[PDB]
Amino acid sequence: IAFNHPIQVDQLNSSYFKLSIPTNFSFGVTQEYIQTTIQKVTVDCKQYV
């Protein structure tokens, strides 16, 4: 089991607030196919039947 690891930040008692700053662009991803339409077909009566 290795799903118990969480990235964390520490709250500050002082009025000033601690924060985490990004430094790397690290671009690149893919997006799921949306399907949009289904194949269109018509059965022919007196042939398939």
């Binding site: 018509t42 022919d44 009566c45 007196k46 042939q47």
Partner: protein, 49 residues
């Protein structure tokens, strides 16, 4: 005129005496007229045997 068993769409006027009939067997358009059970069918692409 020769007689054969046939499926005929029958249109009846106010009198109820048969005035207009459609022979489903003769012509592709007549088969389409028998479908929808209407003398005139809306324009569309229709499959035939």
């Amino acid at each position: 005129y020769k007689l054969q068993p046939l499926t005929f769409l029958l249109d009846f006027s106010v009198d109820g005496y048969i005035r207009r009939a459609i022979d489903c067997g003769f012509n592709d358009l007549s088969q389409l007229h028998c479908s929808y059970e209407s003398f005139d069918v809306e324009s569309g692409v229709y499959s035939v045997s």
